[PDB]
Coordinates of C-alpha atoms in Angstrom, one line a residue:
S1 CA 24.3 -5.8 13.6
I2 CA 22.5 -9.1 13.4
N3 CA 23.3 -9.6 9.7
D4 CA 26.2 -11.6 11.0
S5 CA 24.0 -14.6 11.9
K6 CA 22.8 -14.9 8.3
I7 CA 23.4 -18.2 6.5
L8 CA 20.9 -17.8 3.7
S9 CA 19.8 -14.8 1.7
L10 CA 17.5 -15.9 -1.2
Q11 CA 17.2 -12.6 -3.2
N12 CA 16.6 -11.8 -6.9
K13 CA 19.7 -10.1 -8.4
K14 CA 20.0 -9.3 -12.1
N15 CA 16.8 -11.3 -12.9
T16 CA 18.4 -14.3 -11.1
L17 CA 17.4 -15.9 -7.8
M18 CA 20.6 -16.6 -5.8
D19 CA 22.0 -16.8 -2.3
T20 CA 23.7 -13.6 -1.1
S21 CA 24.7 -14.6 2.4
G22 CA 28.1 -15.3 1.1
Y23 CA 27.8 -19.1 1.5
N24 CA 26.9 -19.8 -2.1
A25 CA 23.8 -22.1 -1.7
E26 CA 22.7 -23.8 -4.9
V27 CA 19.5 -22.2 -6.2
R28 CA 17.7 -23.9 -9.1
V29 CA 14.5 -22.6 -10.8
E30 CA 12.3 -25.1 -12.6
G31 CA 9.0 -24.5 -14.4
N32 CA 6.9 -21.3 -14.6
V33 CA 8.6 -19.1 -12.0
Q34 CA 8.2 -15.4 -12.6
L35 CA 10.8 -12.9 -11.2
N36 CA 9.7 -9.3 -10.5
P37 CA 12.1 -6.8 -12.3
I38 CA 11.2 -4.0 -9.8
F39 CA 11.1 -3.7 -6.0
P40 CA 10.5 -5.9 -4.1
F41 CA 12.0 -8.2 -6.8
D42 CA 9.7 -11.0 -5.6
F43 CA 9.3 -14.4 -7.3
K44 CA 5.8 -15.6 -8.2
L45 CA 4.7 -19.2 -7.9
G46 CA 1.6 -21.0 -9.0
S47 CA -0.4 -24.2 -8.1
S48 CA -2.0 -24.7 -11.5
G49 CA 0.0 -26.1 -14.4
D50 CA 1.9 -29.4 -14.9
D51 CA 5.0 -27.2 -14.8
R52 CA 4.0 -24.9 -11.9
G53 CA 7.1 -23.1 -10.7
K54 CA 9.6 -24.5 -8.3
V55 CA 12.6 -23.2 -6.5
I56 CA 15.3 -25.4 -5.0
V57 CA 17.8 -24.1 -2.5
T58 CA 20.6 -26.5 -1.7
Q59 CA 23.1 -25.7 1.1
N60 CA 26.4 -27.5 0.7
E61 CA 27.9 -29.5 3.6
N62 CA 29.3 -26.3 5.3
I63 CA 29.5 -26.4 9.1
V64 CA 27.8 -23.0 9.7
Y65 CA 24.6 -24.8 8.5
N66 CA 24.6 -26.7 11.8
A67 CA 24.0 -23.7 14.1
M68 CA 20.5 -24.8 13.1
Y69 CA 20.5 -27.3 15.9
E70 CA 20.7 -24.7 18.6
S71 CA 19.0 -21.4 17.5
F72 CA 17.8 -20.3 14.1
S73 CA 15.2 -17.9 12.7
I74 CA 13.4 -17.8 9.4
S75 CA 12.0 -14.6 7.8
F76 CA 10.4 -13.7 4.5
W77 CA 7.8 -11.4 2.8
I78 CA 5.0 -13.5 1.4
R79 CA 1.7 -12.9 -0.3
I80 CA -1.0 -15.6 -1.2
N81 CA -3.5 -14.5 -3.8
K82 CA -7.1 -15.3 -3.0
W83 CA -6.1 -17.0 0.3
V84 CA -9.8 -17.6 0.9
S85 CA -11.1 -19.1 4.2
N86 CA -12.0 -22.5 2.8
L87 CA -8.6 -22.9 1.2
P88 CA -7.4 -26.5 0.9
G89 CA -4.2 -27.7 2.5
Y90 CA -1.0 -26.9 0.7
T91 CA 2.7 -26.9 1.4
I92 CA 4.7 -23.9 0.2
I93 CA 8.1 -24.1 1.7
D94 CA 9.2 -27.6 2.5
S95 CA 12.5 -28.6 4.2
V96 CA 11.8 -32.2 5.3
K97 CA 14.2 -34.9 4.2
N98 CA 13.5 -38.3 5.6
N99 CA 10.6 -37.4 7.9
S100 CA 12.7 -34.8 9.6
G101 CA 13.5 -31.0 9.3
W102 CA 10.9 -28.2 9.0
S103 CA 8.0 -27.4 6.7
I104 CA 5.7 -24.4 6.1
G105 CA 2.1 -24.8 4.8
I106 CA -1.3 -23.1 4.6
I107 CA -4.6 -24.9 5.3
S108 CA -7.8 -22.9 5.5
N109 CA -6.9 -19.6 7.0
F110 CA -3.9 -20.9 8.8
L111 CA -0.2 -20.5 8.1
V112 CA 1.5 -23.5 9.8
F113 CA 5.2 -24.0 10.4
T114 CA 6.0 -27.6 11.4
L115 CA 9.0 -29.1 13.0
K116 CA 9.2 -32.9 12.2
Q117 CA 11.4 -34.5 14.8
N118 CA 10.7 -37.8 13.0
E119 CA 8.0 -39.8 11.1
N120 CA 6.0 -39.6 14.4
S121 CA 6.9 -36.8 16.8
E122 CA 6.5 -33.3 15.4
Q123 CA 5.4 -29.9 16.6
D124 CA 3.9 -26.8 15.0
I125 CA 2.8 -23.3 15.7
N126 CA 0.7 -21.1 13.4
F127 CA -1.1 -17.9 12.3
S128 CA -4.8 -17.9 11.4
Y129 CA -6.0 -14.6 10.1
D130 CA -9.2 -13.0 11.5
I131 CA -11.6 -14.1 8.7
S132 CA -14.3 -11.5 9.6
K133 CA -11.8 -8.8 8.7
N134 CA -10.8 -10.4 5.3
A135 CA -14.0 -11.3 3.4
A136 CA -12.2 -11.0 0.0
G137 CA -9.5 -13.2 1.2
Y138 CA -6.2 -12.4 3.1
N139 CA -4.5 -11.3 -0.2
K140 CA -2.1 -8.7 1.1
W141 CA 1.7 -8.9 1.8
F142 CA 2.7 -9.9 5.2
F143 CA 6.1 -10.5 6.8
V144 CA 6.8 -13.8 8.6
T145 CA 9.4 -14.5 11.3
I146 CA 9.7 -17.9 12.8
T147 CA 12.3 -18.2 15.6
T148 CA 13.3 -21.6 16.9
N149 CA 15.4 -22.6 19.9
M150 CA 16.0 -26.3 20.0
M151 CA 16.5 -26.1 23.8
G152 CA 14.0 -23.2 24.1
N153 CA 10.9 -22.1 22.3
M154 CA 9.3 -22.3 18.9
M155 CA 7.7 -18.9 18.0
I156 CA 6.0 -17.3 15.0
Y157 CA 5.6 -13.6 14.3
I158 CA 3.5 -11.7 11.8
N159 CA 4.5 -8.2 10.8
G160 CA 6.7 -8.1 13.9
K161 CA 3.9 -9.2 16.1
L162 CA 4.1 -12.3 18.2
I163 CA 1.2 -14.6 17.3
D164 CA 2.0 -17.9 18.8
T165 CA 4.7 -19.8 20.8
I166 CA 5.2 -23.3 22.3
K167 CA 7.9 -25.1 24.2
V168 CA 10.2 -27.1 21.9
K169 CA 10.0 -30.8 23.0
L170 CA 14.1 -32.6 24.1
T171 CA 14.2 -35.4 21.4
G172 CA 16.6 -35.7 18.5
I173 CA 16.0 -34.3 15.0
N174 CA 17.9 -34.0 11.7
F175 CA 17.7 -30.9 9.5
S176 CA 17.9 -31.0 5.7
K177 CA 20.2 -29.2 3.3
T178 CA 17.4 -28.7 0.9
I179 CA 14.5 -26.2 0.9
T180 CA 11.9 -26.3 -1.9
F181 CA 9.6 -23.5 -2.7
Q182 CA 6.6 -25.0 -4.5
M183 CA 2.8 -25.1 -4.0
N184 CA 2.1 -28.8 -3.5
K185 CA -1.5 -29.6 -2.8
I186 CA -1.8 -32.0 0.1
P187 CA -3.5 -35.3 -1.0
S188 CA -11.4 -19.8 -9.6
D189 CA -9.3 -22.6 -8.1
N190 CA -5.7 -21.6 -9.0
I191 CA -3.8 -19.6 -6.3
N192 CA -0.6 -17.7 -6.7
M193 CA 2.2 -17.0 -4.2
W194 CA 4.9 -14.2 -4.2
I195 CA 8.0 -14.6 -2.1
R196 CA 10.6 -12.0 -1.3
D197 CA 13.8 -11.8 0.8
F198 CA 14.0 -15.3 2.3
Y199 CA 16.4 -15.4 5.3
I200 CA 17.5 -18.0 7.8
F201 CA 19.6 -16.7 10.7
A202 CA 21.8 -18.9 12.8
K203 CA 20.3 -17.4 16.0
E204 CA 17.1 -16.8 17.8
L205 CA 16.1 -13.3 16.8
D206 CA 14.3 -11.4 19.5
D207 CA 11.3 -9.2 19.4
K208 CA 13.6 -6.1 19.1
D209 CA 15.6 -8.0 16.4
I210 CA 12.6 -9.1 14.4
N211 CA 11.1 -5.6 14.1
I212 CA 14.3 -3.8 13.1
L213 CA 14.5 -6.4 10.3
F214 CA 10.8 -5.9 9.5
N215 CA 11.1 -2.1 8.9
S216 CA 14.5 -2.2 7.3
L217 CA 12.9 -4.2 4.5
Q218 CA 10.3 -1.5 3.7
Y219 CA 10.3 1.9 2.1
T220 CA 8.0 3.1 4.8
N221 CA 7.6 6.5 3.3
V222 CA 6.0 4.9 0.3
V223 CA 2.2 4.6 0.8
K224 CA 0.9 1.1 0.0
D225 CA -2.4 0.0 -1.6
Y226 CA -4.7 -2.5 0.3
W227 CA -2.7 -5.6 -0.7
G228 CA 0.7 -4.1 0.5
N229 CA 1.9 -3.1 -3.0
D230 CA 3.1 0.5 -3.8
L231 CA 0.3 3.0 -4.3
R232 CA 0.7 4.7 -7.7
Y233 CA -0.7 7.9 -9.3
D234 CA -2.7 7.8 -12.6
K235 CA -4.2 4.5 -11.5
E236 CA -7.8 3.5 -10.8
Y237 CA -8.8 2.5 -7.2
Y238 CA -11.8 1.9 -5.0
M239 CA -11.2 4.2 -2.0
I240 CA -12.5 2.8 1.3
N241 CA -12.6 3.8 4.9
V242 CA -11.2 1.3 7.4
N243 CA -14.4 1.5 9.6
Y244 CA -16.8 1.0 6.6
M245 CA -15.1 -1.6 4.5
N246 CA -18.5 -2.9 3.3
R247 CA -19.3 0.5 1.6
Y248 CA -18.7 1.7 -2.0
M249 CA -18.7 5.2 -3.3
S250 CA -21.7 6.7 -5.2
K251 CA -23.1 10.1 -6.0
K252 CA -26.1 12.1 -5.0
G253 CA -26.2 15.8 -5.6
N254 CA -22.7 17.1 -5.0
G255 CA -21.9 14.5 -2.4
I256 CA -20.2 11.2 -2.4
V257 CA -22.3 8.8 -0.5
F258 CA -21.4 5.4 0.9
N259 CA -23.6 2.5 0.1
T260 CA -23.6 -1.1 1.3
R261 CA -21.8 -3.5 -1.0
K262 CA -23.9 -6.2 -2.7
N263 CA -20.7 -8.3 -3.2
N264 CA -18.9 -9.1 0.1
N265 CA -16.3 -11.3 -1.5
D266 CA -15.0 -8.9 -4.1
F267 CA -14.3 -5.2 -4.7
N268 CA -16.2 -4.4 -7.9
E269 CA -18.8 -1.7 -7.0
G270 CA -19.2 2.0 -7.3
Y271 CA -17.1 4.7 -8.8
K272 CA -13.3 4.6 -8.9
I273 CA -10.9 7.3 -8.0
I274 CA -7.6 8.2 -9.8
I275 CA -4.9 9.9 -7.7
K276 CA -3.1 12.8 -9.4
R277 CA 0.3 14.1 -8.3
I278 CA 1.0 17.8 -7.6
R279 CA 4.0 17.5 -5.3
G280 CA 6.3 14.5 -5.3
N281 CA 9.0 12.4 -6.8
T282 CA 9.0 12.5 -10.6
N283 CA 11.2 9.4 -11.1
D284 CA 8.2 7.2 -10.7
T285 CA 4.4 7.1 -10.2
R286 CA 4.7 6.0 -6.6
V287 CA 2.7 7.9 -4.0
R288 CA 5.0 9.0 -1.1
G289 CA 5.0 10.4 2.4
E290 CA 4.3 14.1 2.2
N291 CA 3.1 14.3 -1.4
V292 CA 0.4 16.9 -2.2
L293 CA -2.2 15.3 -4.5
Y294 CA -5.9 15.4 -5.5
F295 CA -8.6 13.0 -6.5
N296 CA -10.3 12.5 -9.9
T297 CA -13.4 10.3 -10.5
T298 CA -15.5 9.6 -13.6
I299 CA -19.2 9.3 -12.7
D300 CA -21.4 9.2 -15.8
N301 CA -18.7 9.9 -18.5
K302 CA -18.0 13.3 -17.0
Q303 CA -15.0 14.0 -14.9
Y304 CA -15.0 15.3 -11.4
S305 CA -12.4 15.9 -8.7
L306 CA -13.3 15.4 -5.0
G307 CA -13.8 18.7 -3.2
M308 CA -15.7 20.4 -0.4
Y309 CA -19.3 21.6 -0.9
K310 CA -21.7 23.6 1.2
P311 CA -24.1 21.2 3.0
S312 CA -27.9 21.6 2.8
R313 CA -27.6 22.4 6.5
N314 CA -25.0 22.8 9.2
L315 CA -23.9 19.2 10.0
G316 CA -21.6 20.3 12.7
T317 CA -18.8 22.8 13.6
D318 CA -15.6 22.7 11.5
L319 CA -17.3 20.0 9.5
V320 CA -17.5 20.3 5.7
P321 CA -18.6 17.5 3.4
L322 CA -16.5 16.0 0.5
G323 CA -18.1 15.5 -2.9
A324 CA -17.6 15.0 -6.6
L325 CA -17.4 18.5 -8.1
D326 CA -16.5 19.8 -11.6
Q327 CA -14.0 22.4 -10.6
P328 CA -11.1 24.3 -12.4
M329 CA -7.5 23.6 -11.6
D330 CA -7.1 26.8 -9.5
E331 CA -10.0 26.0 -7.2
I332 CA -8.5 22.6 -6.5
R333 CA -5.2 24.3 -5.7
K334 CA -6.8 26.5 -3.0
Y335 CA -8.9 23.9 -1.2
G336 CA -9.1 20.7 -3.3
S337 CA -5.7 19.2 -2.6
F338 CA -4.6 16.8 0.1
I339 CA -1.3 15.9 1.9
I340 CA -1.2 12.1 2.2
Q341 CA 0.5 10.3 5.1
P342 CA 1.2 6.6 5.2
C343 CA -0.7 4.8 8.0
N344 CA -0.1 1.0 8.4
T345 CA -1.1 -1.3 11.2
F346 CA -1.0 -5.1 11.7
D347 CA -4.5 -5.2 10.2
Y348 CA -4.2 -3.1 7.1
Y349 CA -2.3 -0.9 4.8
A350 CA -4.0 2.5 4.9
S351 CA -3.3 6.3 4.9
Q352 CA -4.5 9.6 6.4
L353 CA -5.3 12.5 4.2
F354 CA -5.0 16.1 5.4
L355 CA -6.6 19.1 3.7
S356 CA -3.9 21.1 2.0
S357 CA -3.6 24.9 2.0
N358 CA -2.9 26.0 -1.6
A359 CA -1.3 22.7 -2.8
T360 CA 1.4 23.1 -0.1
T361 CA 2.2 20.8 2.8
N362 CA 0.3 23.2 5.1
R363 CA -2.5 21.2 6.8
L364 CA -6.0 22.7 7.3
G365 CA -7.9 19.6 8.5
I366 CA -8.2 15.9 8.3
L367 CA -10.4 13.6 6.1
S368 CA -12.7 11.5 8.3
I369 CA -16.1 10.0 7.9
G370 CA -19.6 10.4 9.2
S371 CA -23.3 9.7 8.9
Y372 CA -25.6 12.8 8.8
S373 CA -29.3 13.5 8.3
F374 CA -29.6 16.2 5.7
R375 CA -30.7 17.0 2.1
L376 CA -28.7 16.1 -1.0
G377 CA -29.4 16.7 -4.6
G378 CA -33.1 17.2 -5.2
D379 CA -34.3 15.7 -1.9
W380 CA -37.5 17.1 -0.5
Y381 CA -36.9 15.4 2.9
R382 CA -33.6 14.9 4.7
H383 CA -32.1 11.4 4.5
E384 CA -29.4 9.4 6.3
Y385 CA -26.2 9.7 4.2
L386 CA -22.8 8.2 5.2
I387 CA -20.3 10.6 3.8
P388 CA -16.6 11.4 3.8
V389 CA -16.4 14.6 5.8
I390 CA -13.4 16.9 6.5
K391 CA -12.7 18.2 10.0
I392 CA -11.3 21.6 9.3
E393 CA -9.0 23.6 11.6
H394 CA -9.4 21.7 14.9
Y395 CA -9.0 18.0 14.2
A396 CA -6.5 16.9 16.9
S397 CA -9.2 14.6 18.2
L398 CA -9.4 12.5 15.0
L399 CA -5.7 12.1 14.5
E400 CA -5.8 8.8 16.4
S401 CA -9.2 7.8 15.0
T402 CA -9.4 4.8 12.8
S403 CA -12.1 6.7 11.0
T404 CA -9.4 8.7 9.3
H405 CA -7.7 5.6 7.8
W406 CA -8.3 5.1 4.1
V407 CA -7.3 2.2 1.9
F408 CA -7.1 1.9 -1.9
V409 CA -8.0 -1.3 -3.6
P410 CA -6.9 -1.4 -7.3
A411 CA -10.0 -1.5 -9.4
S412 CA -7.5 -2.5 -12.1

């Protein structure tokens, strides 16, 4: 397909960063550079120590490396940890030789790709993440795709979505044969960076192009946690609804209630849930596509599993509340299991959960969310409780509702 246009393929093979395009670029790793042994085999970089990691990719004098003067695209999965709003300027991927070439940096909540024509002239497009939607920082994995046409346009994409574009100005420039991955601070406080699958194509990839590459680099059937990593079973998490990201889980009576977080910059409140497998792959602990599973939570020091309970009063038709119950394994089998389904969007890594019939893939309803006025626990009067509620047997209306999207943030 388009793989032909590749002239750089910085991947980790056998615990060793190398070029796999077939052009044999020189890849040197200096300092503290950590390589991930499992998928996505990313390499971690820091901005802390006197020996903070560094990766140097040097392209020989090959001719193919000149298709860069016409059309060329850059793509790579990247993750910046604790990429907070007031982050100070940094350079992460520099490819400027003598005030010429290209560079990639992050300032506050901006990801900027620059194109230095010379020590003076130089353009740049960017991506600035919606801060209001990322209080705890934009710390999730996101795919970047920068397409540059020296006679055409200079565009930047995020998770296959076009975010910015500008007309390339027609002065002369000179691209370098060296790219350096390192977090150099422009002239907690330590931030980390994970890079994975760094490509440079000798053509302008188009929207269609970009997205086929975007998906091909993912195991889309594998549900992902909030930060874009693989969701795993037997691991603690804070479960949260996309529409109520400022809420944490608590307990009242049988119900799980959602209360407003006191900490809006971190996830460290309320009870955690542990996902248990029933039906799925046994090679690993990764939560997949149509896995049947259930939810465990430890409240006081007692163990519960999320399950349906009879409400103090009829809250609505085909509406039955989800709470923390202490039930036997066979009761969970009949109506306490869920069929998960990955559900990702540009904004977040989530999932939809369908009530399972007898621990099978047969769906009986969808897990949504709502606020109801009723009695819980030992209440004398009714109260306003925001609860996770299941829409049983007629939920075609919620299938496209963002209120059915749930994320998992590792409570590690």
